[PDB]
Nucleic acid binder design. Sequence first.
DNA 1: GGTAGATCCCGAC
DNA 2: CGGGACTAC
Length: 252
Amino acid sequence: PQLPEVETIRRTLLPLIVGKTIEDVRIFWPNIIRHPRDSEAFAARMIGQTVRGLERRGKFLKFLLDRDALISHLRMEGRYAVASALEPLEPHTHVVFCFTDGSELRYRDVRKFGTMHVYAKEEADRRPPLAELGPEPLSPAFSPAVLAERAVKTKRSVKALLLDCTVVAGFGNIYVDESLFRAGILPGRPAASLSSKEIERLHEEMVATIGEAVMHLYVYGRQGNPCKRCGTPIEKTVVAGRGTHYCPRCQR
DNA sequence: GGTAGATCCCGAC
DNA sequence: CGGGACTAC
Ligand SMILES: [Zn+2]
């Protein structure tokens, strides 16, 4: 799920778990647990804590408990569900939080790609994976000025820049390509080559693109198909080590 | 330090 | 091979 979907999960999941107390934590794929390193310590420490809140930073979910925070990333295919302990688990369920009321928060992931970190609340923001995370794209902290400053200092492409979690939080591959199209900027352009005008335009489209989604596609996955603005076939290449989609007429 | 690379996964070509 | 977010040049 992308940032907008994660925000939706945050909003919808909260009332389903707030105020519930953890009675057990069952782990069927220990590698998901990244901290504490020992999955048995992870499970042991959460038992007895009550869920108090649920926040989002980038694409990370931060479950707030009594003493600890659980930081969770779903990557591409991870999913949470709240359901009864009396029913069979769905396929590819890797971690289950059992509540004293007989309900469960279950983490599924066909790809087994997600991660979980638990720390005392007060430590979470200064430890991985939240440490170094850039500003929210929808916050005033993410500004043309901030973007311009990172752009001038690097030799990387503008796409590589936008994908950098330290530059801006949780801006995924799809929104990078879409924003660059809407801004009229080629993804392979050196970040430092962007004029002041292009930076302002890019920031504007990044906010608009992600903002609209939080509340169709022009290029992503549309290779070989006509651009919706000019009719030129959308092309796909590899930039910054990822599938990259663009219109060679609209973007310069 | 800045940056590319290696790392984890497995359904689907 | 597709993605997102510790190691070594
Ligand atoms: Zn076009």
